[PDB]
PDB file of C-alpha atoms in Angstrom:
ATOM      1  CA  UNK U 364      39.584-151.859  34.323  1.00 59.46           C
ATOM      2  CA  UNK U 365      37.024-150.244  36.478  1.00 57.89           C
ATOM      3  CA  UNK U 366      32.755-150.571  35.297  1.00 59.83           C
ATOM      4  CA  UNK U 367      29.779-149.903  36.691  1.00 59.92           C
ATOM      5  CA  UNK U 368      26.451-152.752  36.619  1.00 60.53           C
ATOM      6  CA  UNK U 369      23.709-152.639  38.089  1.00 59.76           C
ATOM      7  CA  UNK U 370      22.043-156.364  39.747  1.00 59.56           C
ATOM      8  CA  UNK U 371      18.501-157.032  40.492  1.00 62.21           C
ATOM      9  CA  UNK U 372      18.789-158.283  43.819  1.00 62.93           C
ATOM     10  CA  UNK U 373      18.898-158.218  48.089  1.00 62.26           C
ATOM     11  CA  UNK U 374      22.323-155.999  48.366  1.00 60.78           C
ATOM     12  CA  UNK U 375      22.810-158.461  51.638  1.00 60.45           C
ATOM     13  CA  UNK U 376      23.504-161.059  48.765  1.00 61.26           C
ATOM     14  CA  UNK U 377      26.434-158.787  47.112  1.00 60.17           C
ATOM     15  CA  UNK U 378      29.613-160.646  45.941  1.00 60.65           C
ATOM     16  CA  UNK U 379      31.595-157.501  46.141  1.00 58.77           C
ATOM     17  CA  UNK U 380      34.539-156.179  48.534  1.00 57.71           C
ATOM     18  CA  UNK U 381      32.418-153.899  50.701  1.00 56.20           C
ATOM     19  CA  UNK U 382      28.911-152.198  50.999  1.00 56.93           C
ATOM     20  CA  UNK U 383      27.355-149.220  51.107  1.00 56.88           C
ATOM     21  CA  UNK U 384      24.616-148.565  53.688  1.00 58.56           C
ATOM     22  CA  UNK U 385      22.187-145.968  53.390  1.00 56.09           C
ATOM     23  CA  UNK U 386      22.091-145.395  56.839  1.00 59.92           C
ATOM     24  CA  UNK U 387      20.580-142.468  59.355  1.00 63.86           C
ATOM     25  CA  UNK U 388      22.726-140.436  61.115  1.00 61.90           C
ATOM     26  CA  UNK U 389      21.037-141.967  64.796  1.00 65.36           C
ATOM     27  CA  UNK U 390      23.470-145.200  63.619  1.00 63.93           C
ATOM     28  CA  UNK U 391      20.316-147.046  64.260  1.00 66.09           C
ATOM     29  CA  UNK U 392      18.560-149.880  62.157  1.00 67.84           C
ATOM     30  CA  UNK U 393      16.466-148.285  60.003  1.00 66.00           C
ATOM     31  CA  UNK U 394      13.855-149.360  56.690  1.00 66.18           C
ATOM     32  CA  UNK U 395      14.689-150.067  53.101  1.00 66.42           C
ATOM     33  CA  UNK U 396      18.422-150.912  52.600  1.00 67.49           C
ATOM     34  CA  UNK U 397      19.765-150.410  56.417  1.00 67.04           C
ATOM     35  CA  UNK U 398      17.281-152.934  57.501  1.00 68.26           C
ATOM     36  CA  UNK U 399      18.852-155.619  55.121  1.00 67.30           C
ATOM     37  CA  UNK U 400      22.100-154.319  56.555  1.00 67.80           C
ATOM     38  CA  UNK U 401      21.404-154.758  59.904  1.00 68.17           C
ATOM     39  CA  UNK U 402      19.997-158.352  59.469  1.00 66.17           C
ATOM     40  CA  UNK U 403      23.063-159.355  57.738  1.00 65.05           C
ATOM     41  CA  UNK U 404      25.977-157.012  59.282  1.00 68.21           C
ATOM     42  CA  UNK U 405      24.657-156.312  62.927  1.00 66.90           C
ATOM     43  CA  UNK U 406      28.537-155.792  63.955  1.00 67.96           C
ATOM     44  CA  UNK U 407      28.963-152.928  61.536  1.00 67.57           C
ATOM     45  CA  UNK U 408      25.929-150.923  63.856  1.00 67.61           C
ATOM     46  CA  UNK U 409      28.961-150.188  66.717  1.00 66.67           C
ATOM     47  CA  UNK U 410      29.473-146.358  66.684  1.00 67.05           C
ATOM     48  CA  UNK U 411      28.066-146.244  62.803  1.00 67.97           C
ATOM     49  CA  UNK U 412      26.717-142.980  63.604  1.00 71.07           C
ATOM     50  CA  UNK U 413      27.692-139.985  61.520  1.00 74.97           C
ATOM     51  CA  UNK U 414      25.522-137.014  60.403  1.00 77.74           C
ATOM     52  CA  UNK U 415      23.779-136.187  57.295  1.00 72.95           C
ATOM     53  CA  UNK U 416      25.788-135.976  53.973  1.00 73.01           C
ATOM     54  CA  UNK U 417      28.814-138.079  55.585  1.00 72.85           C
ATOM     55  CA  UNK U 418      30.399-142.108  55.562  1.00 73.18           C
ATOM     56  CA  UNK U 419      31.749-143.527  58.096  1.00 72.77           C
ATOM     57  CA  UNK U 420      33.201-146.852  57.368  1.00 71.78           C
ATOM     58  CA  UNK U 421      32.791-149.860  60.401  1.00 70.34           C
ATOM     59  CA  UNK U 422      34.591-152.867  59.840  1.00 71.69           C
ATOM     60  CA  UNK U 423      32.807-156.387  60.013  1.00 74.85           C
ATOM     61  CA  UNK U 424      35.387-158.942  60.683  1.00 76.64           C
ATOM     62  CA  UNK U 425      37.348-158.526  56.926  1.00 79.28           C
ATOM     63  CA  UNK U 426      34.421-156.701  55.636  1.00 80.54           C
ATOM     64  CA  UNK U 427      34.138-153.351  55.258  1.00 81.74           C
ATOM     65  CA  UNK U 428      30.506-151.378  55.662  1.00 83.31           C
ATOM     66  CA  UNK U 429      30.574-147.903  54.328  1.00 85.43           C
ATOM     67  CA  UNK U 430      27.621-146.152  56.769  1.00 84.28           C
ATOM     68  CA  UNK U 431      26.464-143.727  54.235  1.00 84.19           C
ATOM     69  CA  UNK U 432      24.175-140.620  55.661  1.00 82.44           C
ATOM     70  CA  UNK U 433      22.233-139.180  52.510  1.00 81.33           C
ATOM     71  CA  UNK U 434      19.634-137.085  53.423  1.00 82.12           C
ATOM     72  CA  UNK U 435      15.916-137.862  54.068  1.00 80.12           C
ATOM     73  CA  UNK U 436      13.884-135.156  51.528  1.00 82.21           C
ATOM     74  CA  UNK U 437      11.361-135.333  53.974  1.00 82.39           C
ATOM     75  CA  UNK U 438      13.826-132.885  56.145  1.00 82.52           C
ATOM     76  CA  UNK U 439      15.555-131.101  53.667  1.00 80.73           C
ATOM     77  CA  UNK U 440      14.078-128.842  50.937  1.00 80.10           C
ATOM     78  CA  UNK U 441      14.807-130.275  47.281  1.00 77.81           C
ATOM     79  CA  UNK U 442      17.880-127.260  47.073  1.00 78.35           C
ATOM     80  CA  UNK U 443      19.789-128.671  50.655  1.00 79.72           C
ATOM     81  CA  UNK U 444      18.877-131.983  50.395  1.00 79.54           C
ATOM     82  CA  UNK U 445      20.816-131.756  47.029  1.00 82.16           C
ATOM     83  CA  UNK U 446      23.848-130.888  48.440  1.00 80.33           C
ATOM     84  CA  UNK U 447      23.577-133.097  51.128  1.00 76.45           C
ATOM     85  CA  UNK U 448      23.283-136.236  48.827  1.00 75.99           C
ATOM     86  CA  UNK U 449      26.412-135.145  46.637  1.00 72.99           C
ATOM     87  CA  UNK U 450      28.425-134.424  50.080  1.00 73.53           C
ATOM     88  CA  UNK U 451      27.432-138.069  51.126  1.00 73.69           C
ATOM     89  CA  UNK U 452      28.432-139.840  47.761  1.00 73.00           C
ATOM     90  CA  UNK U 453      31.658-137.943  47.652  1.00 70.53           C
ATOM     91  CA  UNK U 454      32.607-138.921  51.377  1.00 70.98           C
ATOM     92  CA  UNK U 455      31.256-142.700  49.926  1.00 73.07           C
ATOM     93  CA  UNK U 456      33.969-142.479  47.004  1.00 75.84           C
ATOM     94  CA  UNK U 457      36.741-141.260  50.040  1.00 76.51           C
ATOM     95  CA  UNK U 458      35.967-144.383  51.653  1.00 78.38           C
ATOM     96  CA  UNK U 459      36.303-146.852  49.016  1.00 74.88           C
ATOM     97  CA  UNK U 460      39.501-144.983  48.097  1.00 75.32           C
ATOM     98  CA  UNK U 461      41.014-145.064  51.954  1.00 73.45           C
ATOM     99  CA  UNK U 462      39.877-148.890  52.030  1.00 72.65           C
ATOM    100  CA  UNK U 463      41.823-149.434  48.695  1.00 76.39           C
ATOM    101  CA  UNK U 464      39.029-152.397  47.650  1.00 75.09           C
ATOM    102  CA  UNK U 465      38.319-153.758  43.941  1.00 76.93           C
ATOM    103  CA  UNK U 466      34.775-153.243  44.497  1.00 74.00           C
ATOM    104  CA  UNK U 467      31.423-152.083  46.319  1.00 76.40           C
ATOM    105  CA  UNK U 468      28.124-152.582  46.037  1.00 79.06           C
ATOM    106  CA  UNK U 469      26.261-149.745  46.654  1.00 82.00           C
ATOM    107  CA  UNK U 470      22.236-148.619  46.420  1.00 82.82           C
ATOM    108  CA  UNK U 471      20.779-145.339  45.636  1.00 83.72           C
ATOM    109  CA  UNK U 472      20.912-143.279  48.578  1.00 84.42           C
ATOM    110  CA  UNK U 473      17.733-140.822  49.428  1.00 85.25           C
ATOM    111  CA  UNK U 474      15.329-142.888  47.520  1.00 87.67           C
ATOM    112  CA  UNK U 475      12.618-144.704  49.292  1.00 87.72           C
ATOM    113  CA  UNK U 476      12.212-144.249  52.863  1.00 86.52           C
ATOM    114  CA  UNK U 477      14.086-140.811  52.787  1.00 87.02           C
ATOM    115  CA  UNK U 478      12.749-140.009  48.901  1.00 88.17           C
ATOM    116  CA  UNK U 479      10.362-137.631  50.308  1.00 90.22           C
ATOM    117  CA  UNK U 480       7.236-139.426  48.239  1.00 93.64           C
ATOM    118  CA  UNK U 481       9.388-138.765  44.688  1.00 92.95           C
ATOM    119  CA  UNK U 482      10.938-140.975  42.136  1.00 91.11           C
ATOM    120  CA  UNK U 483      14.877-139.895  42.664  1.00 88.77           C
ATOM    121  CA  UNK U 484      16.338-143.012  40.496  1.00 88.52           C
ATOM    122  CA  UNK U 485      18.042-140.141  38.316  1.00 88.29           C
ATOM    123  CA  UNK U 486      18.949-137.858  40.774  1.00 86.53           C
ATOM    124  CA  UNK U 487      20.644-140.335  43.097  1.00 87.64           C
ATOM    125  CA  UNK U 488      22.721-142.314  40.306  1.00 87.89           C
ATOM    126  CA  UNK U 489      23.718-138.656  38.750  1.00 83.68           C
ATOM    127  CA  UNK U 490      25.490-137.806  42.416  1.00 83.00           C
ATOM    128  CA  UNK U 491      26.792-141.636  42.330  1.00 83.67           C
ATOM    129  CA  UNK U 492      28.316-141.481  39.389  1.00 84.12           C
ATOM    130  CA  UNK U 493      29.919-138.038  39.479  1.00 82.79           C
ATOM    131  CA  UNK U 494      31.008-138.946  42.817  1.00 83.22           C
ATOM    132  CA  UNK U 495      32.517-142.373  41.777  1.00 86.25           C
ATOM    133  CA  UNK U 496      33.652-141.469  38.794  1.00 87.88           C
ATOM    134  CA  UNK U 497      37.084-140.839  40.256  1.00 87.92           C
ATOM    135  CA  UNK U 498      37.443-144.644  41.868  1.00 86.80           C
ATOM    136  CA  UNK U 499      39.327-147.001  40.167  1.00 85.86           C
ATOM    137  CA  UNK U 500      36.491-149.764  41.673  1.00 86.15           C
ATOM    138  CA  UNK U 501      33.943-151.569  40.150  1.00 88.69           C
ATOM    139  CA  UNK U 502      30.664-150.503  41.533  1.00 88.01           C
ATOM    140  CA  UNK U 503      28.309-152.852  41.111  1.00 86.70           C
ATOM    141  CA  UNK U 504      24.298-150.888  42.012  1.00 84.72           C
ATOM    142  CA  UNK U 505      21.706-152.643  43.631  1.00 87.12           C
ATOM    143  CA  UNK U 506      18.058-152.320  43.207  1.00 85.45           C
ATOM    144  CA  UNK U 507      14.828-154.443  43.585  1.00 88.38           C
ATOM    145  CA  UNK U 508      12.617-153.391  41.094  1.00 86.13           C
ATOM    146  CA  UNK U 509      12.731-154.524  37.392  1.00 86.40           C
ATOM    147  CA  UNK U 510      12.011-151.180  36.082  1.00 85.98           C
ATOM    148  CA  UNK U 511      14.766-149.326  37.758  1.00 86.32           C
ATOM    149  CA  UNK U 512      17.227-152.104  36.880  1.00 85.32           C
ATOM    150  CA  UNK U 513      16.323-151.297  33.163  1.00 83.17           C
ATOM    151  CA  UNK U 514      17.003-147.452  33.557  1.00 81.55           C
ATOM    152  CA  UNK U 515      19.812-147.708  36.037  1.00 84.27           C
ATOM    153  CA  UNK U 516      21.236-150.358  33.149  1.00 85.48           C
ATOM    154  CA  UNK U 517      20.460-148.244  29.941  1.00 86.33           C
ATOM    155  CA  UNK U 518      21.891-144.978  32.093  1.00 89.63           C
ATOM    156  CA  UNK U 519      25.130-146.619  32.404  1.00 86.34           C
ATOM    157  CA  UNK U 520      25.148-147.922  28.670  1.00 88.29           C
ATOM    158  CA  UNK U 521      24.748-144.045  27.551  1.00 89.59           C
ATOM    159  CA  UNK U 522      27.596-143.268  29.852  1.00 87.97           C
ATOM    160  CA  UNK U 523      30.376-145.906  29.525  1.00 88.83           C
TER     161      UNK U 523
END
């Protein structure tokens, strides 16, 4: 009975089946959320590479971590990088399909390091919810701050 939630908290500390990292298209350890991901999945960096607006999944042991290339708006222009971060959350919702899991944990890609200097909390969890809309998983969103827990939270309510 698939929902979405969203948890205050490290994503490296996620209790679901598999994560999402918002990763670079180099493969390489990165800021933000792929530094977290690197600290606590190192394995998962073998051949993680994959360009912009794709997922490629690399398994860690049993666990599954869904590489996830959304664009850096400092590159793109607002119109490309658009496309590019609905092309990488669609290729996110093939994975978790192919991998056949009961849930992911999963952070909003192309904010932060790769937001360009703009609030994209809207933006990224419109593209992650159109995109995993058609998952039967639970997708549990992980953020740090208490305000975008509280929008990501009442965005879901108004949706579900």
């Amino acid at each position: 009975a698939p929902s979405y939630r969203v948890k205050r908290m490290d994503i490296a500390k996620n209790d679901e089946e598999c994560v999402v990292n918002a990763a670079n298209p180099r493969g390489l350890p990165g800021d933000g959320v792929c530094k977290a991901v690197y600290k606590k999945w190192p394995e998962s960096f073998k051949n993680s590479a994959t360009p912009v607006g794709t997922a490629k999944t690399v398994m860690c042991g049993t666990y599954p971590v869904i590489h996830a290339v959304g664009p850096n708006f400092s590159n793109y222009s607002e119109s490309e990088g658009d496309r590019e971060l609905a092309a990488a959350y669609r290729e996110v919702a093939k994975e978790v399909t192919r991998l056949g899991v009961n849930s992911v944990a999963i952070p909003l890609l192309s904010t932060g390091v790769y937001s360009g200097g703009k609030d994209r909390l809207t933006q990224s969890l419109n593209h992650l919810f159109t995109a995993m809309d058609s998952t039967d998983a639970d997708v549990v969103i992980y953020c740090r701050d208490k305000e975008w827990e509280k929008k990501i939270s009442e965005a879901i309510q108004m949706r579900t």
